[PDB]
RNA sequence: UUGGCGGAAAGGCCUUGGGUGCUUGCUGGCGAAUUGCAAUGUCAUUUUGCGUGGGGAUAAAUCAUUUGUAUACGACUUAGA
RNA sequence: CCCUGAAAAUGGAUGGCGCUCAAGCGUGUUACCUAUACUCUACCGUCAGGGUUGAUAUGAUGCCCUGACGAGUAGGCAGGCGUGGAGGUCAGUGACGAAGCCUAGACCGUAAGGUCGGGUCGAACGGCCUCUAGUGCAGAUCUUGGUGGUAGUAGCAAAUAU
RNA sequence: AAUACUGCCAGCUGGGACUGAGGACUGCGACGUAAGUCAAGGAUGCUGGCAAUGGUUAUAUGCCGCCCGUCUUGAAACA
RNA sequence: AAUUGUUGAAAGGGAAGGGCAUUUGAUCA
């Protein structure tokens, strides 16, 4: 959602050029933010190791308004409510166990083929 | 045959030519295109430069950078000829072109490499004699191409050099043909000659 | 266990959907002529859908034939299911998607002391 | 259409290749003499000879016997019609016309 | 021995195609050194392999193989018409294929 | 019921096959091919490498030798198609091939669940192998450069042209 | 390993001396199989990351402030350890 | 044959590339490519000509044999799928899961449609022979409800000013 | 005399592709003095490999493909 | 369902969407 917006700088280092500075939703997004984070904390995880691992934002039922326009018509001027969810975790990930074995089918020439190879190389 | 084809555009009508190296280029062969400034086309020379003056007034009316672009180098005449021959379009088609690379004169790369003619596409067997023709460098120059003389000179020095070559190799040939002269009259040169090798 | 049957051929093996399906969302995946004047497909040109035919039918001795070379036969009961006792080589039994796991281990149980293929034997299963 | 004097050889092909009967109104190939003769023995023909020779030699059955064989449904030349537009005629340079005695080429290539 | 081939190369020229509708089941293979119908009438019948590759091995190795037969000749120039058990991607329109000298009759 | 009934059930009594008119007889095998012939294969593992055809089985495979001491292809069974015939022919006169036939070569088709996941020669195969070359190098050797010709594998360069080559 | 030539895209070529193999130019010996009548019967190259040894140095840009030869915002042009 | 006669407005048409003992023009001869065209074969449907109560054995509206044909707007006829209800039957299914919904999962039928596997789910539902209709949507600037591009855009600038 | 051209062979033969429908016998024919056999009212024998072929969907490739319904002789229309 | 947000998969030189056949990826008896 960034048709006919202004363009900055300060949005260089994301790559993009145009970029806005909301407050309303960053006020709301950090106050979750710092639930989740007493949240974490009631559980017991440690905040070193703790990523926003998940987030969305949804639409909620909007507030029907009214406005007034010429000649006497009545226009649609509602609001677009916020449903924000948000999912911390602690990061963890060294290695994994891979696949399972795959075993291959072969056929009577190529098992002979690889007898041959066996018996010729060292 | 060869995994990469030179082709030299010496005495080459640049139809015939350009219809050869689509369809081979088509059927799936590299092809490499120098000395493209010797190319000769059917025709006086004020006959193609009329046509290239008509040619040149197309262009698109309300923004003339989106028009066609009139390339004037011999190299770039010879592409957009084989460009009209092969569909460009289709993904086939841009692969048939990425195989083609069309160079004005001898490239670096390229001199130290044998050069193979069309026997189908050249001028001194295709036009009449007392025919006119005309030069595609010539065309060029005379259109707005502005290395004509460069060219000439790296021609002149690669031609010096293949010269002094061909010296070697032609000493080299008569000593081999010398030693091959003395090994003959032999036992196994009878046999060779009975069995035809 | 199929009797010896030709080879299951089939002149058509899409499925024939309706013109425009894929462009508008009120028009489903389910055939309907088109009957407009000027209609494409209706006219039948070149590079359009293809309307189903009368030749685009089967052979009527490999018709409703399974590619296991058994019929479909919709069971229900262990009584439904006594049907099929000197049939079970052109016909196999289905257990409908009604019936709970307390008769289909039953139903399951008759059909194997009987010789009698089931094409869903996983059905309401614990795994 | 096409059509010329056809010869013994080319009728004998034409009878024993393509050669089909109209028995109760229905194409019956014709692969045996005893068919030819029960739908033909009253006029005195009984085998595919016989039918051939009815053919070539107009007799008092000719008629009976060409009624009773199915016109030939031929294929198209196998060498081409040899002329580059058909509805032209044989001296004009096409296979519209009469063509004589060289039909028998163009009816051995289509059969 | 430098060079160890039992075939002869091959190059895909297109389907048995028309000015506007084409037929991938029948595909056109040029042979190098053929010209002319006559001698275009000797590698009839013989098996004719393209030979890829991919990047998932499917039994063991990750070369496959289509196979497809030559039917009959195609044009004064030497191509012949080829019919493949599985049609061609079409993606191979000048690719290099093997046309093996088996069956053999000479 | 699902389904209430089907109204005739297909008799589940198989018909046998009507009599065909389709008898065997014995292959009749191209002019160029008469035992003694060289042969270069064209498929298989000895592929290129020259062979000389020695007996015509039953089974329509012709009996061929790729004798032990000259390239070391074993007594074998080929087929007509996968073979070319050169000119040059060593005659087999005085050889016996009648004990190798269609039973000689006895498959003993492997066992089924026990595959080779993992992981020979008969000494009879060996014996007659061994009676069989020592003639055929005996007779092979009166002629120059046979040997060396049999040892050497056929291959195809550039510019060759099988349908122009005479082999 | 010594030297020379090549700038158009040189990125390649020639050449000097030694070492490491082969040599089918000719004459011998040894083994080739149980891969079963064909089933591509691999050995070439285009990138990315991973692991092992030798080798080369420890940098810039943007935002922030500001300048004005610049401008709607961008952007341009500057400066400040 | 060619040339003057022969001049119209965006930049363009033997389709263009291009072609000159032509790849231009007239004529003569072969080879080559193809239509849902022609010949044969496999399958489906329709029609016509027939056989088949000497049976346990049922569907003679069933089965089989032979031949021919298969385009199509308005329109007519015939054969079939599905929806809401009622009668007979399945002493039908089901709280250990009925209906409904979802399901680039599977099967059958050329097709309308039917069936199975899994998830959600919570009290009803289905097959067979018939009768009945308020029985099938893709449009009618169709009636009602909700929702998108526009769009976080126009704009929130009269009345002196914080 | 030979040869060119046309037409005939119930003269022979080499190579390649598609198709395998029907399912105990019934008929028309040939070989065989005779048993019996056959290319004679629709393909069988042997052998090899596997226990991958193939179905659905996404992308890619070669070709084709104008927007549904109505009015109209004429529709996709700038109706 | 229209519409919308995340996760997982694919494509994207001035459209997308479909048919004729196949390669590759995912899945399937």
């Known amino acids: 959602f960034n048709s006919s917006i202004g363009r900055t700088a300060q949005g260089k280092e994301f790559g993009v050029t145009k970029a806005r500075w909301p ?19 009631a559980k017991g995880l440690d905040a070193t190791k703790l990523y926003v691992s998940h987030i969305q934002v949804n639409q909620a039922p909007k507030q029907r308004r009214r406005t007034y326009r010429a000649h006497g018509r009545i226009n649609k001027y509602e609001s677009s409510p916020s449903h924000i969810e948000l999912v911390v975790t602690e990061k963890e990930e060294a290695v994994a166990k891979a696949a399972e074995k795959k075993v291959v089918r072969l056929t009577s020439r190529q098992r002979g083929r690889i007898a041959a190879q066996k018996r010729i190389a060292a | ?150 060219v000439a000179k790296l021609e002149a020095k690669r031609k010096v050099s293949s010269a002094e070559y061909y010296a070697k190799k032609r000493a080299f040939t008569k000593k081999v043909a010398s030693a091959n002269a003395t090994a003959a009259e032999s036992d196994v040169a009878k046999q060779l000659a009975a069995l035809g090798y | 266990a199929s009797l010896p049957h030709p080879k299951i051929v089939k002149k058509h093996t899409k499925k024939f959907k309706r013109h425009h399906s894929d462009r508008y969302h009120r028009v489903a995946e389910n055939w309907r002529k088109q009957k407009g004047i000027d209609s494409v497909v209706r006219r039948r040109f070149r590079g359009n859908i293809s309307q189903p035919k009368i030749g685009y039918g089967s052979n009527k001795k490999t018709k409703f034939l399974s590619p296991s070379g058994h019929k479909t036969f919709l069971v229900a009961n262990v009584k439904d299911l006594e049907t099929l006792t000197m049939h079970t080589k052109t016909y196999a039994a289905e257990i409908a998607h009604n019936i709970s796991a307390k008769n289909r281990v039953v139903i399951l149980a008759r059909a194997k002391a009987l010789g009698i293929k089931v094409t869903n034997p996983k059905g309401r299963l614990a795994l | 259409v096409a059509y010329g004097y056809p010869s013994y050889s080319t009728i004998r092909q034409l009878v024993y290749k393509r050669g089909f009967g109209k028995i109760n109104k229905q194409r019956v190939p014709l692969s045996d003499n005893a068919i030819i003769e029960a739908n033909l023995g009253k006029y005195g023909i009984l085998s595919i000879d016989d039918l051939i020779h009815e053919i070539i030699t107009v007799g008092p059955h000719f008629k009976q016997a060409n009624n009773f064989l199915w016109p030939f449904k031929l294929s198209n030349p196998s060498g081409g019609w040899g002329v580059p537009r058909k509805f032209k005629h044989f001296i004009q340079g096409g296979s519209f016309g009469n063509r004589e005695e060289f039909i028998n080429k163009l009816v051995k290539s289509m059969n | 021995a430098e060079s160890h081939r039992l075939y002869v190369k091959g190059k895909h020229l297109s389907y048995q195609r028309s000015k506007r509708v084409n037929n991938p089941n029948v595909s056109l293979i040029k042979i190098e050194g053929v010209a002319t119908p006559q001698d275009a009438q000797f590698y009839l019948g013989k098996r004719i392999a393209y030979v890829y590759r991919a990047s998932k091995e499917v039994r063991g190795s990750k070369i496959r193989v289509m196979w497809g037969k030559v039917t009959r000749t195609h044009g004064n120039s030497g191509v012949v018409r080829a019919t493949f058990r599985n049609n061609l991607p079409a993606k191979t329109f000048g690719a290099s294929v093997r046309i093996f000298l088996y069956p053999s009759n000479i | 019921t699902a389904q209430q009934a089907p109204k005739w059930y297909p008799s589940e009594d198989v018909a046998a096959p009507k009599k065909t008119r389709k008898a065997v007889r014995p292959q009749k095998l191209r002019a160029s091919l ?134």
Do not use: C
Request: charged share 30%; glycine share 6%.
């Open chain 6, 34 to 167: 008469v035992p003694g012939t060289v042969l270069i294969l064209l498929a298989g593992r000895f592929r290129g490498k020259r062979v000389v055809y020695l007996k015509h089985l039953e089974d329509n495979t012709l009996l061929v030798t790729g004798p032990f001491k000259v390239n070391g292809v074993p007594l074998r069974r080929v087929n007509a198609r996968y073979v070319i015939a050169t000119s040059t022919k060593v005659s087999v006169e005085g050889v016996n091939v009648e004990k190798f036939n269609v039973e000689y070569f006895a498959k003993e088709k492997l066992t089924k669940k026990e595959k080779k996941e993992a992981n020979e020669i008969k000494t009879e195969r060996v014996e007659d192998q061994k009676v069989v070359d020592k003639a055929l190098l005996a007779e092979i050797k009166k002629t120059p450069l046979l040997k060396q010709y049999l040892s050497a594998s056929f291959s195809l360069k550039n510019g060759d042209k099988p349908h122009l080559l005479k082999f």
């Open chain 2, 1 to 150: 045959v060869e995994p990469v084809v030179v082709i030299d555009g010496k005495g080459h009508l640049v139809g015939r030519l350009a219809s050869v190296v689509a369809k081979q280029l088509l059927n799936g062969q590299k092809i490499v295109v120098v000395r493209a400034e010797e190319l000769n086309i059917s025709g006086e020379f004020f006959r193609n430069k009329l046509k290239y003056h008509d040619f040149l007034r197309k262009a698109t009316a309300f923004n003339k950078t989106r028009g066609p672009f009139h390339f004037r180098a011999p190299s770039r005449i010879f592409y957009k000829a084989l460009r009209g021959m092969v569909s460009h379009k289709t993904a086939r088609g841009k692969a048939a072109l990425e195989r083609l690379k069309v160079f004005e004169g001898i490239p670096p790369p390229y001199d130290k490499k044998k050069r193979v003619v069309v026997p189908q596409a050249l001028r001194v067997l295709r036009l009449k004699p007392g025919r006119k023709y005309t030069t595609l460098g010539k065309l060029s120059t005379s259109v707005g191409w502005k290395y004509e003389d460069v």
């Open chain 1, 23 to 41: 407050a309303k939703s960053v006020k709301f997004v950090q106050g979750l933010l710092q639930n989740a984070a007493a949240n974490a904390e």
